[PDB]
RNA sequence: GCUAACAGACGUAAAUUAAGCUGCAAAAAGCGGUUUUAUUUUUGGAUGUAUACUAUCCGACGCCAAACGGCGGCAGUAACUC
């Protein structure tokens with residue numbers, strides 16, 4: 001069902017085709033490659049896939065669901081940002097579009113660089129601040145795919161983890177520069193778990 | 194005219210974070226005050242709002258004080274009596 005790169009390099013990364021191989025892995029891989037080819041030039045070779053990519057390949061996801069997922073991923077993030085995000089860690093495709101929308105909106109609320117913890121600068125320069133907030137959240141997602149797993153802790157504990165990082169030295173603007181340069185949120189999320 | 198009226202529970206409603214503006218003496222940090230926001234918790238009417246809700250009366254429709262509730266006597270006047 002996949003005359004292409006051999007299964008030997010792919011059986012060591014994906015243990016999903018042991019059970020639901022026939023229509024499942026081949027059609028989902030073909031539809032995902034076509035769904036990213038119809039996007040802005042994404043190849044999606046299967047070698048980069050990690051064993052945590054049981055999602056988007058498990059028996060029960062339709063190819064139409066993958067088509068909606070990639071369309072929602074290039075709708076929630078800009079396709080230049082979505083292409084930069086998908087260059088590293090394709091595990092973002094595992095999330096459902098509604099849950100990914102919820103996590104991105106919660107990240108935009110807590111990490112709002114425009115104003116307060118509330119979504120500052122509601123939509124001339126308010127739209128400019130809102131676009132900067134979308135850029136900041138997509139840059140954090142490019143830097144770390146694990147920030148999309150915030151609702152495992154809570155939608156309201158993103159601020160709690162951010163202050164657990166915040167209490168050491170100074171205020172928010174220094175920390176938006178600091179957290180974008182180093183992954184300080186991973187220890188805070190592990191401390192919350 | 195809305196946290197409505199009306200009907201009930203009655204000795205009185207507040208709990209946990211977050212952001213902002215801050216302030217005190219001070220060798221590189223602690224505790225606060227105030228405004229806004231988030232989660233709860235905040236009985237029906239009502240997740241309603243004067244074309245809506247409640248109360249009272251008449252009980253469709255058709256034709257000519259809509260609050261309790263009625264709406265007098267005396268003794269005579271019209272070419273035969275009355």
Ligand SMILES: [Mg+2]
Nearest residue numbers: 194243245246
């Ligand atoms: Mg009236």
